[PDB]
RNA sequence: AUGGUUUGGCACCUCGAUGUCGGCUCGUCGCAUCCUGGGGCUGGAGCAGGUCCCAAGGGUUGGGCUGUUCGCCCAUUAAAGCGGCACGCGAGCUGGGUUUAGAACGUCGUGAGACAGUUCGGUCUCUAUCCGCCGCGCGCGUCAGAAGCUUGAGGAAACCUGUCCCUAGUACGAGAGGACCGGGACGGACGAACCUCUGGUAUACCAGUUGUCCCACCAGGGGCACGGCUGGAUAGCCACGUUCGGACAGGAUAACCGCUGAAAGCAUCUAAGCGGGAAACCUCUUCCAAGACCAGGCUUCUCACCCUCUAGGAGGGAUAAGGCCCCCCGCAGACCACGGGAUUGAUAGACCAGACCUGGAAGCCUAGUAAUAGGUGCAGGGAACUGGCACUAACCGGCCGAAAACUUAC
């Protein structure tokens, strides 16, 4: 069914396709993943596979995590994340200790990359919500960037919740859908994905088969 | 990148020297007209003896822009002025002679007569 | 070391001649005209070169029929079959943006003798 | 080196440049100075790169130092003892030590000094 | 804007209890023989004789 | 018959103050629907309309004139909807109009003056206590103390649309004209992520240069003049840039189309039933989510040691797994929090190299009367990016932090 892998955003570069068009590609280190646990309906109520990724010194792991990894039967990894499948038929193709690499995907496939958006800090309504500012001249008094009105006058009497105002921005999980895989370099465990994927370089991402275009 | 109230030199021989953009056709609240886009324009400056007159509401197609424009193969084209060619409803020039180079974008937009008449197409 | 270098170098294109801003070149550019091929040559002055490795671009400026034209190409673009350098210019700048305001006699470039 | 991310030290860029030059002159003149911790944090790379210029001490490097130091006795000492003393040490010519807070404004204080071990 | 009402004692005290100071942590050190407490941030300076101990 | 969207009537509400129109900014709701969606009859041949039903998901342009709303006009568009909410919104903004004091015109008055007549000018105050709302923490709880990974009750977001191409110049139609249904591509507006490209920025980058002062002088530099001014300009942040999105499928329905047929020996889409049927609804896509008090699940780690009162419970101390503070930091950040590192170390700085920006350093030599040019030499200088390198700083360290039992069943 839906495949998936844990990886790292390396950066963006340029390639040219066979028709000489240029393709902006994000390079993802779809490094080797090891299956650490299988979630089954008979035990957990849902079907899922849990993958581990990244390298860490064994002295950096705490005793509970090391115990979980030892019970699974593999050496610890930095990152652990779960892939939600649909049914046990889709869970039967994974077993603990199995190694997942970048070649599970193919050239021209469609993927959904999930990462953590870049942080923006405390942002104003103009940046956080695209509010049009007020005028820069013609008498406007210290309202060049302020939101303006906030509600009604009597019948509202309050501010409706969900009202868009300034606050913290970014640092949220974001999924980009229907990205095309331009090339699957099997030597370096590298995926060439056309477009921009969420997060900063060196961030952790999950690449999954697209849910709409697949 | 041409918008409303922008002024364009006329690269034809219809007698119009300069037109002002009134509307960028091709969708509601459309903002900018690049190479190959069709605009509604009014003539601001005209040759004294030409067929067109000042204040005529005409239709033109943008053929040169100062703002550089990306192409499919990653290349860019840029000109030193914004120019337009006055056309009729069948996408044919109202003049008989095109001045200066034009962009390749007029081919995919099916402006074959203008492309043929142009001194050179880039 | 430019971590993406291993990905980059596979698509890097050799045989690019050495040239610097201020030189006069002719870029042989293949074009599509109704599903057939031909090479259209752009002859002008290299006014800038923005280094990036595979993302390298250079800009060539020519005056044609009284209107100046600028074209920016990727250095390793497969849509360029071949670049040929005619003369070497003598300039004191890395980017010749001032040439956008000069015409004819004042827009000429010293030749590196 | 790396510019400061936030507002400059003295209240302006020019004041910060003069402040760094004076602090470096004082450090090379005395061997250790006491100041606020952010000032020493900003001083470390600046003084270390001046010492690097003095290490490969040629006329060009001397003029590079003089376009910052402005004091000639300090330049002479920097190019006659300090440079040769750090001949076979690759970086890390200074160290920062945190000391007790100031009383008038509770400003965190630190001591920056040249290493003298080898 | 001005306060419309006088604060009750409960609200004033509940907000006022948040204005407090934290106790710095202290570690032992041996300077001139005698043991004494010092903040860990100043341990190296104390060992170098750069911090005045009364 | 509805409504209080119009002017009204009453004066119950305030004269120990309830801002008066438009506009801007930001909304939210209704459906009496402007477009898109589904139908019915056509005085519907097709196209296209008329007209009537269902449908509120999204969308619903920019300008000229006027203080205007209103309105007329100009270009478009799928369309340029009608209304409620103090005719929403001045402790959010404006002050053009109206509504003080100056002055003038017409008219009225003997006059002082006046005019729901005109004209020019004319101070818009406030440090947010409470509720509300947008974000971020601290404490306690979730029957030992911890740690990974999670299910999701329940919520929030999003929902737009055009042109062209194949089918097809067929159906219909005297011809003209003109298709249904179904696939494809390219757009406009909007939103998100992102920085390879393009473009902007650039107050510790490189270069040129003006005036002046200083470095004893020359040479070479520096301070100040908006970074003095110019020409560029990597990182970061950005849009004018790049990529992606709005789906598909299922369920129950609206108007409507029906099937099988009673009361009512026929009939009747209906009272028994069974089907189809929409951008509306439920799923489906994305995000938050166990303070979800029914405070969840799957696992893993520690799983122990004293002292006091009177041993009933309590209190105190010391610990484990683990955590926090201090420390080095970050593209994480108002603070806090979050994330990483901490000598069993590449966390930051330095140093070495590369990438990139600038554009040919100094000194010396040569040519020239000199201004200046050429060689040494892709030189010199340099931030953010990449890789090495323990040289400097992450330290002979403090504070927290683990179990009454009972009942029944097996």
Swiss-Prot record, chain A:
Keyword Ribonucleoprotein included in the entry's annotation = yes
- Mind telling me which Pfam families this protein's record contains? Ribosomal_L3 (PF00297)
Keywords for this protein? Ribonucleoprotein, Ribosomal protein, RNA-binding, rRNA-binding
Q: Which domain of life is it from?
A: Bacteria
Query: Which one GO biological process term can you cite for this protein?
Result: translation
Report a single Gene Ontology molecular function: rRNA binding
Residue stretches in coiled coil: none
Any single Gene Ontology cellular-component annotation: cytosolic large ribosomal subunit
InterPro entries the record matches: Ribosomal_uL3, Ribosomal_uL3_bac/org-type, Ribosomal_uL3_CS, Transl_B-barrel_sf
Question: What does the protein in this record do?
Answer: One of the primary rRNA binding proteins, it binds directly near the 3'-end of the 23S rRNA, where it nucleates assembly of the 50S subunit.
The entry describes its oligomerization and partners as: Part of the 50S ribosomal subunit. Forms a cluster with proteins L14 and L19.
- NCBIfam families given in the database record: L3_bact (TIGR03625)
Family per UniProt?
Belongs to the universal ribosomal protein uL3 family.
Q: Which HAMAP family match?
A: Ribosomal_uL3_B
What is the designated name of this protein? Answer: Large ribosomal subunit protein uL3
Species of origin reads: Mycolicibacterium smegmatis (strain ATCC 700084 / mc(2)155) (Mycobacterium smegmatis)
UniProtKB/Swiss-Prot annotation, chain C:
Note one Pfam family from the annotation.
Ribosomal_L19
Q: Which PROSITE patterns match?
A: RIBOSOMAL_L19
Q: Name one GO molecular function term.
A: structural constituent of ribosome
Taxonomically, the superkingdom here is: Bacteria
Q: Where is the signal peptide, in residue numbers?
A: none
Set out the biological process GO terms recorded for this chain's protein.
Answer: translation
**Listed transmembrane segments:** none
Swiss-Prot/TrEMBL keywords: Ribonucleoprotein, Ribosomal protein
Name the InterPro entries on file. Answer: Ribosomal_bL19, Ribosomal_bL19_CS, Ribosomal_bL19_sf, Translation_prot_SH3-like_sf
As for family, the record states: Belongs to the bacterial ribosomal protein bL19 family.
What does this protein's UniProt record list under function? This protein is located at the 30S-50S ribosomal subunit interface and may play a role in the structure and function of the aminoacyl-tRNA binding site.
Cross-referenced NCBIfam families: rplS_bact
Q: What is this protein called?
A: Large ribosomal subunit protein bL19
Q: Which organism is it from?
A: Mycolicibacterium smegmatis (strain ATCC 700084 / mc(2)155)
UniProtKB/Swiss-Prot annotation, chain D:
GO terms, molecular function = structural constituent of ribosome
GO cellular component, as recorded:
cytosolic large ribosomal subunit
What processes in GO biological process is this protein linked to? translation
- Keywords associated with the record: Ribonucleoprotein, Ribosomal protein
SUBUNIT field: Part of the 50S ribosomal subunit. Contacts protein L32.
- Entry similarity comment: Belongs to the bacterial ribosomal protein bL17 family.
State the protein's name. Large ribosomal subunit protein bL17
Lineage at the top is: Bacteria, Bacillati, Actinomycetota, Actinomycetes, Mycobacteriales
Which section of the whole protein is represented? 2 to 119 of 199
Swiss-Prot record, chain E:
Q: Which GO terms describe its biological process?
A: translation
State the UniProt keywords alphabetically.
Answer: Ribonucleoprotein, Ribosomal protein
What GO cellular component term, any one, is given?
large ribosomal subunit
Tell me the Pfam families matching this sequence.
Ribosomal_L32p
Note the InterPro entries from the entry. Answer: Ribosomal_bL32, Ribosomal_zn-bd
Q: Does the keyword Ribonucleoprotein apply?
A: yes
A molecular function annotated in GO for this UniProt entry is:
structural constituent of ribosome
Similarity section: Belongs to the bacterial ribosomal protein bL32 family.
Q: What is this protein called?
A: Large ribosomal subunit protein bL32
Q: Which organism is it from?
A: Mycolicibacterium smegmatis (strain ATCC 700084 / mc(2)155) (Mycobacterium smegmatis)
């Amino acid at each position: 069914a839906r495949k998936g892998i844990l990886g790292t955003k390396l950066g963006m570069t340029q390639v040219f396709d066979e028709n000489n068009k240029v393709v902006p590609v994000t390079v993802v280190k779809a490094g080797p993943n090891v299956v650490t646990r299988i979630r089954t309906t008979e035990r957990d109520g849902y079907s899922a596979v849990q993958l581990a990724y990244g390298e860490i010194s064994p002295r950096k792991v705490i005793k509970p995590v090391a115990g979980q990894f030892a019970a699974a039967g593999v050496n610890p990894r930095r990152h652990v994340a779960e892939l939600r499948l649909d049914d046990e038929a889709a869970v039967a193709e994974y077993e603990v200790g199995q190694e997942l690499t970048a070649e599970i995907f193919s050239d021209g496939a469609y993927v959904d990359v999930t990462g953590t958006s870049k942080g923006k800090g405390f942002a104003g309504t103009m940046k956080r919500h695209g509010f049009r500012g007020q005028g820069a001249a013609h008498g406007a008094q210290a309202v060049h960037r302020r939101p303006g009105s906030i509600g009604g006058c009597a019948t509202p009497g309050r501010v409706f919740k969900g009202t868009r105002m300034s606050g913290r921005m970014g640092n949220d999980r974001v999924t980009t859908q229907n990205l095309k895989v331009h090339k699957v370099d099997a030597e370096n465990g590298v995926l060439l994905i056309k477009g921009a994927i969420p997060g900063r370089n060196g961030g952790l991402v999950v690449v999954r088969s697209a849910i709409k275009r697949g | 990148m041409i918008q409303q109230e922008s002024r364009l030199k006329v690269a034809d021989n219809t007698g119009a020297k300069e037109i002002l953009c009134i509307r960028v056709l091709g969708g509601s609240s459309r903002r900018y007209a690049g190479i190959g886009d069709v605009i509604v324009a009014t003539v601001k400056d005209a040759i004294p003896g030409g067929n067109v007159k000042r204040g005529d509401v005409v239709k033109a197609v943008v053929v040169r822009t100062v703002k550089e424009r990306r192409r499919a193969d990653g290349s860019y084209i840029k000109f030193d002025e914004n120019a337009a060619v006055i056309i009729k409803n069948d996408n044919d020039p109202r003049g008989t002679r095109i001045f200066g180079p034009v962009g390749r974008e007029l081919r995919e937009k099916k402006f074959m007569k203008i492309v043929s008449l142009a001194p050179e197409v880039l | 070391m430019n971590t993406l270098d291993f990905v980059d170098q596979a698509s890097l294109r050799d045989d690019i001649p050495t040239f610097s801003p201020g030189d006069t070149v002719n870029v042989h550019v293949k074009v599509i005209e109704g599903s057939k091929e031909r090479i259209q040559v752009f002859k002008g002055v290299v006014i800038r070169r923005q280094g990036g490795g595979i993302s390298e671009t250079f800009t060539v400026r020519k005056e044609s029929y009284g209107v100046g034209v600028e074209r920016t190409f990727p250095v390793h673009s497969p849509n360029i079959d071949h670049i040929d350098v005619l003369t070497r210019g003598d300039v004191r700048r890395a980017k010749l943006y001032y040439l956008r305001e000069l015409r004819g006699k004042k827009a000429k470039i010293k030749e590196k003798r | 080196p790396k510019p400061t991310k936030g507002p400059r030290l003295g209240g302006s860029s020019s004041h910060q440049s003069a402040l760094l030059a004076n602090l470096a002159t004082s450090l090379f003149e005395h061997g250790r100075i006491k100041t606020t911790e952010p000032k020493a944090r900003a001083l470390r790379p600046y003084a270390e790169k001046l010492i690097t210029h003095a290490k490969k001490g040629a006329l060009h490097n001397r003029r590079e130092v003089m376009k910052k130091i402005r004091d000639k006795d300090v330049v002479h000492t920097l190019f006659a003892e300090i440079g040769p003393f750090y001949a076979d040490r690759n970086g890390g010519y200074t160290r920062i030590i945190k000391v007790e807070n100031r009383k008038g404004d509770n400003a965190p204080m630190a001591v920056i000094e040249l290493v003298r071990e080898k | 804007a001005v306060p419309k009402r006088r604060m009750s004692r409960a609200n004033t005290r509940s907000r006022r209890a948040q204005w407090k100071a934290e106790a710095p942590g202290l570690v032992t050190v041996s300077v001139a023989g005698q043991q004494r407490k010092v903040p860990r941030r100043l341990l190296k300076a104390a060992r170098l004789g750069l911090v005045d101990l009364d």
